[PDB]
Structure 1
Amino acid sequence: TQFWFWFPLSHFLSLAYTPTCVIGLNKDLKMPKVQYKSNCKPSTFAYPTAKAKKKEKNPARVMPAQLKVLTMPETCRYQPFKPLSIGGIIILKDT
């Protein structure tokens, strides 16, 4: 907010940027491969339908309002056991 009196204070704004990505990891490092669904329409997902598709972990980018329209993959192999209501790193449990 106060950047006149020290012009390098335009640089602290990088620390304001936060991760918004839907992650999930089955061990400390292992990446499985899975794609789960969303309930919305495929045009609001854009960042320049029956379901949208996300990533398997890199993780997928996400909207803070699309955090509830996701659904854990009921038919694929790897399933997040914990209720997934935000992005970030969680468990992706194999059955």
Structure 2
Amino acid sequence: TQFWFWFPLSHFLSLAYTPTCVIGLNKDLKMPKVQYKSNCKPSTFAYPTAKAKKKEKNPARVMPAQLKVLTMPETCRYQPFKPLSIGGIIILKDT
């Protein structure tokens, strides 16, 4: 907050940030190829439709509005296990 009083207070915002992304970690080193869809209009891809491509670990940067309109994939080798609503690092299951 009051970083005039102490200039390191402006540095101190380290632990304040968590990623908004999507991560297909089935095995801890494994990089599979999944393609699900984000049902927003494709202008929410504005990063300063029919479907999307948000996989392939880096992970893909996501929007919280994109995190509530998602849908699991049907044709991949890895159709996931849990219904997805949380961002960051999440589930995957082979089917």
- After TM superposition, the score normalised by the length of structure 2 is 0.87
For the Cα contact (< 8 Å) 1:21–1:62, is it kept in 2? yes
Q: CA RMSD in A?
A: 1.4
Alignment of 1:4-83 (within 5 A): 4-83=4-83
For the Cα contact (< 8 Å) 1:24–1:88, is it kept in 2? no
Cα separation, 1, equivalents of 2:3 and 2:9:
5
Q: Report the alpha carbon displacement of residue 57 of structure 1 after superposing the two structures with TM.
A: 4.0
For the Cα contact (< 8 Å) 2:26–2:91, is it kept in 1? yes
For the Cα contact (< 8 Å) 2:23–2:57, is it kept in 1? yes
Q: 1:26 to 1:87 in 2, by over 3 A?
A: same
Structure 1 moving runs of 4+ over 6 Å: none
Q: 1:56 to 1:73 in 2, by over 3 A?
A: farther
For the Cα contact (< 8 Å) 1:81–1:91, is it kept in 2? yes
Cα separation, 1, equivalents of 2:26 and 2:54:
17
| Deviation by residue 1:23-58 (Cα, 9 ceiling, x = unmatched) | 121112211012211111111221122112212342
Unpaired runs of 5+ residues, structure 1, are: none
Percent identical residues: 100
| Deviation by residue 1:49-76 (Cα, 9 ceiling, x = unmatched) | 2112212342111111211211111111
